[PDB]
Design a protein around this nucleic acid. Sequence first.
RNA 1: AGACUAA
Length: 451
Amino acid sequence: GSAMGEPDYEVDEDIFRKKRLTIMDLHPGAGKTKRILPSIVREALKRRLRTLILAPTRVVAAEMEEALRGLPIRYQTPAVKSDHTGREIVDLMCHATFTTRLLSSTRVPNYNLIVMDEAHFTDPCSVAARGYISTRVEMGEAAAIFMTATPPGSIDPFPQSNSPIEDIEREIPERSWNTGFDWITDYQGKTVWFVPSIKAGNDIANCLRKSGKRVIQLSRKTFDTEYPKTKLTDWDFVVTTDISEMGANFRAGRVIDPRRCLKPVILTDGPERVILAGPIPVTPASAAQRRGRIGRNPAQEDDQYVFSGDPLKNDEDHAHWTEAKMLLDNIYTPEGIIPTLFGPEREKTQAIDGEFRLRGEQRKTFVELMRRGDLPVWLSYKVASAGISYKDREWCFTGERNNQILEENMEVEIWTREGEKKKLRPKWLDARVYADPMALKDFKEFASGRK
RNA sequence: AGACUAA
Ligand SMILES: Nc1ncnc2c1ncn2[C@@H]1O[C@H](COP(=O)(O)OP(=O)(O)NP(=O)(O)O)[C@@H](O)[C@H]1O
Ligand SMILES: [Cl-]
Ligand SMILES: [Mn+2]
């Protein structure tokens, strides 16, 4: 038994048995990351198990380090510093980092125990990782624990909380507002506001600041400076992307959740391509995770979740289910077997088993395009599978007439590293590389041969 | 779009 936030002395021996995959589906704020996890890691260390701990984001990694501080853990995330003797038998890294390692030249340690926090995360690397882990368990090579308040097959957007939550449906602004949204700025406590993009966040964040509100903006771009400020440190609003959707302990009073998101979609009608669809409603799991950021303190009983609209459970057109198979078809176990997707995540797309496996140089290029080229999984797969070498950018100019990329209604031109002027007209279209002007800027550098 | 950045 346990008290006071401290990890339990008593840990179920069952969870360490090879072939055991344990699902810990406790509600948000139950203590998965900060109470249960450290008790498991302590017991793993006693059992001398080579252990891997996986966090979906640096926000979750940061939470874990708070819980695990003082224990012999090798942190393999920029979110955390620093040990490090090299003799640690416990590693901690992000979901996507692990999948990167699996696809790379370096081999992963043979972990006896794998702990995946937020094991519902629909990022394609996280899905592919779950495939690998459940295969390692099934083969009897490891024991694994999947922790999440919203396991796959979750439908309930309003789960149990530590403290009562007042759920309120209201219209929520997507852009700056002049008037008519007084409930936003009249609230006295601390608010966490989820935004679908950094750009949307910027606009909302500056609009709050002209009211004298202290606003902290959180995303992949500002995490390093700004996350400690959510901890130290008094503020009014956190305007955040989904970087904060899981695991965050903001000690806040209110969540504002427009329940909207853009979604990449693979289009099959005509030449295959990726578009950015929406904004569309979020999934029930995302809604529940976002809501879960409040009602976390039983001593604080008046927390609010302000949301707009219903969630949309059907995300079978989201490119992530295909992109997960593209990654997993190119991952192996030392015994030779290509992993299959974790059970509840099978047949989200229609197969085909091994359809995406790449041979020889094609696999290395595939990985390079993602890691060095910063290209999406789908686009990297398309280029690699065409037998194109990483440095060969001819494909950026040889697309059909319809594939010409426009910016401010003008045909995008590229000056190559050799000094040719060519119209940007890629053989494959993925909106993720051209929709946002910052993404387009990076894709232009790629096309130029400067990446 | 959002997330990741390892040996
Ligand atoms: N630094 C802190 N100070 C006070 N309370 C905290 C702190 N960190 C966490 N808590 C509380 O400890 C409880 C357990 O937190 P945690 O282990 O993050 O829960 P969890 O089950 O992982 N939640 P989630 O990730 O939302 O599914 C919650 O009630 C938190 O509000
Ligand atoms: Cl909290
Ligand atoms: Mn957690």
